[PDB]
Design a protein around this ligand. Sequence first.
Ligand SMILES: O=C(O)c1cc(O)ccc1O
Ligand SMILES: O=C(O)c1cc(O)ccc1O
Ligand SMILES: [Zn+2]
Length: 257
Amino acid sequence: HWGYGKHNGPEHWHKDFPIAKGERQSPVDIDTHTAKYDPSLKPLSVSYDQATSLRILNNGHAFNVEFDDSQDKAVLKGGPLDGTYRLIQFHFHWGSLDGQGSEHTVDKKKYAAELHLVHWNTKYGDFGKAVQQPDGLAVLGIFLKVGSAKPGLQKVVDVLDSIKTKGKSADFTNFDPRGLLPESLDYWTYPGSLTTPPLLECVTWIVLKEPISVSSEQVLKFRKLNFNGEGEPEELMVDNWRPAQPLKNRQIKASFK
Ligand SMILES: O=C(O)c1cc(O)ccc1O
Ligand SMILES: O=C(O)c1cc(O)ccc1O
Ligand SMILES: [Zn+2]
């Protein structure tokens, strides 16, 4: 099945998922000079005070922090979005080295990692119906650079030893995703896709300009995770990023002047 290796990585995905070569694939490179400020963007609203985390799962590709999305509780709205999108999970992509790891790039610059907070449009009832729609999802993308530690990430780092291998999960209640956000909500936005199979073209991407800093020790613990299952040969979970895809007939808009 699919993965990030030589024989099952991003260059092979198109054979099972032809949309890999579609008209609005993600990630992309963000050319900061070509992005245009958009005065029609409404203020972005990230409302995570009642977020209710449940569980953290190693899915053999990344790890997901999963949320209870059964009530109206952790929502993203405003900016380019019409209506209200509800948080369902977050996950990361990261490298084997600090020089690479992010999926989006900024003027071809790769950050050490990238955080994706995934939300579905509540007009569609749940995530499964949302991913049948061109505006079903919104992903808030946040770059990570290596420098000072991010204190709000440490509860994630410390639980990773308990989910080292594919299929393992752990209770992960009361985690506050507000502690993962940078100061500024300045962002770039464009229409694109999920960045793993099935690569569905449902996503309004909102990529924050300001990275968060995490420590070298925090990212090193991400790289101790495994893609393999328990009792299988070790294949460290590193370089679980898809490279930038063709922009095609898209424009990237900036929320800032
Ligand atoms: O993601 C995978 O399944 C994978 C498998 C490999 O054999 C080597 C690197 C990988 O990232
Ligand atoms: O971001 C992704 O690639 C993604 C893929 C899925 O199949 C489900 C949720 C996701 O967020
Ligand atoms: Zn992702």
